[PDB]
Amino acid sequence: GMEQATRTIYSEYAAYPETQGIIAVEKRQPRDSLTDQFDVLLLVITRDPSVEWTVKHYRLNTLRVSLHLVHEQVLSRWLILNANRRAVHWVSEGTIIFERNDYLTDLKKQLRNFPETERCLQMSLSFAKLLRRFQDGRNLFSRGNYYDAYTHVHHALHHLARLSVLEKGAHPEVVVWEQARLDDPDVYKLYEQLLLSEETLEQRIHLALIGLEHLLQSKVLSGGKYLFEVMRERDRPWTMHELMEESRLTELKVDLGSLVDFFIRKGLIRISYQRTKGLGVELVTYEPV
Amino acid sequence: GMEQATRTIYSEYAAYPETQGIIAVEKRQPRDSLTDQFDVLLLVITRDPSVEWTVKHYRLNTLRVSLHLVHEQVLSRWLILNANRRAVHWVSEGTIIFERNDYLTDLKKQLRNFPETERCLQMSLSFAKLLRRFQDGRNLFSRGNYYDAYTHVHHALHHLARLSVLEKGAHPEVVVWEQARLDDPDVYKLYEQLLLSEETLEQRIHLALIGLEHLLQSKVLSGGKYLFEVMRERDRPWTMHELMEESRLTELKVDLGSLVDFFIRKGLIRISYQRTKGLGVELVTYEPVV
Ligand SMILES: [Cl-]
Numbered sequence: 001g002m003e004q005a006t007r008t009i010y011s012e013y014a015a016y017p018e019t020q021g022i023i024a025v026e027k028r029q030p031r032d033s034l035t036d037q038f039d040v041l042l043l044v045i046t047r048d049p050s051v052e053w054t055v056k057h058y059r060l061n062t063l064r065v066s067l068h069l070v071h072e073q074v075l076s077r078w079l080i081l082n083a084n085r086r087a088v089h090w091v092s093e094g095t096i097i098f099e100r101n102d103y104l105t106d107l108k109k110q111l112r113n114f115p116e117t118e119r120c121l122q123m124s125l126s127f128a129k130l131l132r133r134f135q136d137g138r139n140l141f142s143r144g145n146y147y148d149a150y151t152h153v154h155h156a157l158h159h160l161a162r163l164s165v166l167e168k169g170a171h172p173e174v175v176v177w178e179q180a181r182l183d184d185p186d187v188y189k190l191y192e193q194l195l196l197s198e199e200t201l202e203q204r205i206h207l208a209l210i211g212l213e214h215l216l217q218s219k220v221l222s223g224g225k226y227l228f229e230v231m232r233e234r235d236r237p238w239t240m241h242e243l244m245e246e247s248r249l250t251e252l253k254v255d256l257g258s259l260v261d262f263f264i265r266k267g268l269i270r271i272s273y274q275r276t277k278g279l280g281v282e283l284v285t286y287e288p289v
Numbered sequence: 290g291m292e293q294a295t296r297t298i299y300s301e302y303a304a305y306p307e308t309q310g311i312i313a314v315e316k317r318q319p320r321d322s323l324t325d326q327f328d329v330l331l332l333v334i335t336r337d338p339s340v341e342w343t344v345k346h347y348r349l350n351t352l353r354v355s356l357h358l359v360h361e362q363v364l365s366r367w368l369i370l371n372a373n374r375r376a377v378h379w380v381s382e383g384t385i386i387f388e389r390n391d392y393l394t395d396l397k398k399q400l401r402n403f404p405e406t407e408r409c410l411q412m413s414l415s416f417a418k419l420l421r422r423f424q425d426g427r428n429l430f431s432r433g434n435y436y437d438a439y440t441h442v443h444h445a446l447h448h449l450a451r452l453s454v455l456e457k458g459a460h461p462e463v464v465v466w467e468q469a470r471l472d473d474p475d476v477y478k479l480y481e482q483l484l485l486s487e488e489t490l491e492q493r494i495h496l497a498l499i500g501l502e503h504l505l506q507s508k509v510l511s512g513g514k515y516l517f518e519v520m521r522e523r524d525r526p527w528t529m530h531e532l533m534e535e536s537r538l539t540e541l542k543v544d545l546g547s548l549v550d551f552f553i554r555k556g557l558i559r560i561s562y563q564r565t566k567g568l569g570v571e572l573v574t575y576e577p578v579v
Contacts, residue, residue, distance in 0.1 A: 008570060033424070036546055055546060057529040057573040059562050064573070066546075135322075136463065147466035150484060151447055158440055174425065177436035195439065201484060240346035257344060257355075261326050273348050281297055284346035284353070 002026060002040055003097050009058055009065055010042055014098045018047040020072050021104040023094035034089065036066040043090045044069045045103065072103075079111070080118050081125070081251065082171050114169060120226035121251060123166045127223025128255035130159035131262055134212050141205055150194075150201070153208045157191045160215060167222050187215060217266075224263055227252065228288040237272060237285035260286055291315060291329055292386050298347055298354055299331055303387040307336040309361055310393035312383035323375065325355040332357045332379050334364055334392065361392075368400070369407050370414070370540065371460050403458060409515040410540065412455045416512025417544035419448035420551055423501050430498060435490050442497045446480045449504060456511050476504060506555065513552050516541065517577045526561060526574035549575055 002024040013019050023043040027035040035041040038057070042065060053074050056067040070087075078084035079091075092111050096104045137152030162172040164184035173179065181188045190211040194204050230248045231238060243249055243256055252259070263269040270289050273282040291313040302308050312332040316324045324330040327346070331354060342363050345356040359376075367373040368380075381400050385393045422445035429438035451461040453473035462468060469477045479500040486493035519537045520527060532538060532545055541548065552558040559578050562571040 008568075033547075037550055053542070054533045055529055059571040059573055060569060140464070145464055145467065147480065147484070148464045151443075151466070154440075154443055175429070175434050175437050177440070178434060191436065195436075196490060240344055244343050244345075253342075257325055280349060282348040284348060 002095055005063055006040060006042060006060070006065055006097070009060065009067065010044070010097055013044045013046075013069075016046070016048070019044060019098070020047060020100050021045040021096070021107070022098040023090055023104060024097050025090050025094045034086065038064040038066045040065050041090065042067045042097075043087075043094060045072050045075055046070070047072055080121070082118075082122055085174060088171075114171065117226070119166060119169065120229070123163060123222045124224070124226045124252060124259070125255075126159050126163040126166060126172075127219065128252070128259055130156055130163060130212075130216060130219075131223070131258060132255070133159060134209070134216060137205070138209055138213075141209060146201055146205060149205050153205055153212065154194065156212055157187070157194065157208065160187050160212065160219075161191065163219060163222060167219070186211075190215070220263075220266055220268065223259070224268055227256075227259065227263070228268070231286070231288045237270075237274070237287040239274075239283045239285055243286065291384060294352055295329060295331060295349065295354055295386070297349055298356065299333070299386055302333050302335075305335070305337070307338075308333060308387070309336060309390065310334040310388040310396070311386040312379055312393060313386050314379050314383045323378065327353040327355040329353075330355045330357065330379065331386070332359065332376075332383065334359055334361050336361050369410070371407075371411055374463065377460075403460065406515075408455060408458065409518070412452060412511050413513070413515040413541060413548070414544075415448050415452040415455060415461075416508065417541065417548055419445050419452060419501075419505065420512070420547060421544065422448060423498070423505060424547075426494075426501075427498055430491075430494055435494060438494050439490065442494055442501065443483070445501055446476070446483065446497065449476050449501065449508075450480065452508060452511060456508070479504065509552075509555050509557065513548070513557055516545075516548060516552070517557070520575075520577045526559075526563075526576040528572045528574055532575065 006024060010022050013022060021044070025035055025041045025043070027039050031037050040063060044067060046069060048071070051069055051071050053068070053070045056069065058065045058067065075087060078087050088111065091104070091107055099105065133152045133156035137149045137156055140149035140152060158176070161176045161180040161184070164187050165172045165176060165179045168183045170179065170183070177188065177191065190208060194208045197204055197207070199207065227249070230246065231243075240257070243260070244253055249256065260269055264271050264286075268289055270287045272285045272287070274285050275282045295313065299311050302311060310333070314324055314330045314332070316328055320326045329352060333356060335358060337360070340358055340360045342357070342359045345358065347354045347356065364376060367376050377400065380393070380396055388394065422441045426438050426441035426445055429441060447465070450465045450469040450473070453476045454461040454465060454468045457472040459468065459472065466477065466480065479497065482500075483493055483497045486496075488496065516538070519535060529546070532549070533542055538545060549558060553560050557578055559576045561574050561576070563574050564571045
């Protein structure tokens with residue numbers, strides 16, 4: 001079908017030992033972004049060391065084919081972080097054209113599951129974004145910059161919506177407000193009010209910031225769980241550099257500092273100071289409470 | 290000063306030959322985000338090959354010090370892309386504690402300039418995101434998902450304000466709507482209409498999409514200029530793979546497919562097909578028009 005139709009394109013890839021799998025996805029309608037506005041999209045997953053992610057475009061007779069070539073480690077990370085909703089669809093709905101080591105058979109199976117570790121990491125990442133948007137919106141609002149405050153407050157609600165979906169054990173999709181209308185009615189209502197309430201712009205932002213601050217408190221443990229679990233893997237305090245250098249925390253580096261600060265203030269993390277023997281300098285240390 | 294007060298901390302860094310500069314920034318207020326809620330932030334720029342970007346936290350006597358260790362190429366990129374507003378602030382307002390090869394003195398000067406190539410790249414990146422948010426917004430509206438469409442429409446408008454600011458030759462800031470109030474009143478007014486709208490949710494979104502589609506077409510050349518210039522560096526069409534592999538387009542890889550699709554529909558890029566001799570396969574090829 002698609003296997004026959006694209007054989008002259010994909011066969012060379014199948015032949016290269018590093019290829020782990022080939023999936024084909026047929027357009028759903030014309031101008032499908034799913035298939036790059038082409039007729040068929042081929043996803044070739046490889047261990048080729050020279051590859052991260054690239055794209056090739058072909059036409060075979062009348063069939064226009066877009067080929068996405070992606071390292072197995074790139075795709076894995078996208079999946080783990082839920083950073084590519086298209087890729088998820090490709091794998092789950094796509095047709096297996098070729099595989100080694102049952103790579104795609106197993107991948108489809110794994111996609112029906114949401115490992116806790118992945119979910120919790122994703123919650124920390126969302127929480128971190130919510131916290132930053134909230135803070136910026138708050139600060140901007142204080143300074144009477146209402147149009148710019150509205151922007152951050154708005155983005156904050158969106159991350160909160162996403163977090164609320166994660167909290168209920170589901171992956172956030174592009175249609176998140178519909179997800180959260182049930183997964184979390186309180187969050188939905190805040191958004192509805194910011195958008196449609198009869199109040200003034202200044203008042204709408206104020207009211208949104210109050211609701212946000214409150215929900216932000218409510219969800220602190222959700223935002224921190226992954227971090228705390230990593231930190232407890234050792235029976236003693238961490239230096240900031242140690243946290244920053246920890247592989248399990250690599251995706252959080254950008255936000256670690258702000259998160260740790262917030263968690264200290266909430267009494268979830270303990271800050272101390274350890275002076276080096278023979279020296280004057282102290283290292284700031286952090287420990288989960 | 291800060292030099293004297295942090296000497297015990299930074300000295301070992303100044304000694305490492307790969308270190309290009311050390312900047313000190315003092316807190317402006319308590320719990321200053323600028324300095325990581327510490328008293329002094331030290332920024333160490335280094336060519337240490339093991340370094341991308343990392344942070345260390347110290348207390349020296351009573352003084353709490355955050356140390357940001359960043360590779361020169363990581364910083365450069367941040368500055369090229371305008372991806373880190375704090376860093377711009379650090380380098381520009383910061384006190385030079387140490388440097389090699391006038392690295393920091395020159396950097397401070399360079400920061401007063403907005404190179405054309407960097408501006409144009411930023412404009413393509415902004416335009417790329419505007420285009421994607423607009424498309425999602427339109428799609429979600431078509432499907433009756435209004436709360437979600439609003440989300441994308443709003444984001445698209447935010448990208449449009451940033452683009453409009455770049456167009457006038459300035460770096461977008463955190464207070465972009467303020468900047469846009471004068472840099473592009475038409476964009477500002479479209480946003481204002483959306484916020485202060487008394488229409489139905491559906492209607493206000495629909496009106497915002499109309500306005501967006503218009504302004505998008507209007508700024509098409511701002512968005513495509515960097516891409517077109519790179520493309521015209523050769524006198525024949527490009528395959529998609531060739532475009533994807535071109536180093537100058539690295540930052541645009543994620544959006545190149547959509548940008549190209551868009552530019553084809555606006556008549557700025559020409560799509561053709563070249564069949565490989567002896568084979569049935571054709572490579573799709575792209576060329577800027579005019
Ligand atoms: Cl001892």
